[PDB]
Amino acid sequence: NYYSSNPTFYLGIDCIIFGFNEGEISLLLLKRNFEPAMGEWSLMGGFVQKDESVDDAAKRVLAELTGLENVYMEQVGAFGAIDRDPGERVVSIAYYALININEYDRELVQKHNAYWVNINELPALIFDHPEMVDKAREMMKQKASVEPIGFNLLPKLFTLSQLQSLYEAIYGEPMDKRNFRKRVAEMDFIEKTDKIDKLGSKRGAALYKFNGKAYRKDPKFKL
Amino acid sequence: AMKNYYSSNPTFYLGIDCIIFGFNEGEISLLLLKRNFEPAMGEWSLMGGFVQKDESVDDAAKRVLAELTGLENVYMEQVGAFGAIDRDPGERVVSIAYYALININEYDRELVQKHNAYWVNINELPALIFDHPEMVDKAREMMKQKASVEPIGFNLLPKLFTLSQLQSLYEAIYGEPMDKRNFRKRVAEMDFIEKTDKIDKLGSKRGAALYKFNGKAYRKDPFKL
């Protein structure tokens, strides 16, 4: 009764999907195999349905591309400039996700014509997607300094050089090897295993694990 | 082929909701509606509205705020998009919450009276309808974080303020007492907080030195207190 004199709008979802590999952060991007903007680069996206909450729409859109569930996700914001989408008025809610770049459904990715691209060497993204990406990076950077969300970008078992390399990539600057390793030593919820990562016959390094339960007993993450 | 790329999807009401912070006599307050309209007439809520066809989401938030307070060029931050299915039991509404910092000594009182709105101490709030309590919590958390790293607090104060008022404000932001001496030191070292030759006079017996925030000077060189 009360709300009907107001207009209604398409509610897009757009996903900034972060991955980490070989000292580089990358985004999972569509090279669109559909109109509008076929052939152009964009974030993975969709629309909110009547079935679902906005949060669940984000989960669904991410699962449609990657097959993943229970993904670490944060809402970035609601982008609502009038002409952000030239085809129609669409207000899009952006989310970012941190996934293990080693674990996703390769079939689904191939069928969406999607690609991992280094975050500092992105092609031109359509619409206001470049803007969304900028805001997502800034928020993730900020959160990753005060909370251990970084470990979602790594496999369950990781080495310290891998971990250092992650934080070097997040902040785009080198870190002192020595004192970084002391910060981890006195961080109790980062447990050292008896397993090693064996890249090759000449390469090995101790594998560590992130202990979620032990972190929440004392949420003192800072590095 | 893309003929129904858009139209195959549903459309939703886009709500606007404003958490409006004020500060006065050492307390942070929120400007709330005791609704004089339905739904939830007689219950307490945030100031609200809906995005229209001619306007962006941010401009909707400005408009809504202006409808209540008459204020423009207000410091505002988008809090988030709240899109749980049943947040509004009457109808499906995805609402985009904003917070605003205003000077409680300057607003349109008849506009506020028209909307039957009242300032309430943020620690002694009435029950708010729908998911408004969740919006306030998130807004408080965000505003607190931002105020430690940027000088957004000065929007809560008059152009001229005493260090006593400033300290009081930050004590209220952080809900804890601060060391008067160390606080004075951090303000003395900030060049963009200029001391004035004016004093705040309450009676003939009360006086205190007034200060000013110089945004120009600040943006030349950025704040931590």
Residue numbers in the entry:
A (entry chain A): 3 to 225
B (entry chain B): 0 to 221, 223 to 225
Quoted from the paper:
The NrtR family transcription factors are characterized by an N-terminal Nudix hydrolase-like effector-binding domain and a C-terminal DNA-binding domain.
The solved structures provide a first view of the structural mechanism underlying the regulatory function of the L-arabinose-binding Nudix domain. The Nudix signature motif GX5-EX7REUXEEXGU (where U is a hydrophobic residue and X is any residue) is strictly conserved in all known active Nudix hydrolases, but it is impaired in the NrtR regulators of NAD metabolism, several of which are known to be enzymatically inactive. Similarly to NrtR regulators, the Nudix signature motif is not conserved in the AraR proteins from Bacteroidetes, where two or three glutamate residues are substituted with other amino acids. These observations suggest that AraR regulators are also enzymatically inactive and utilize their Nudix hydrolase-like domains for ligand binding.
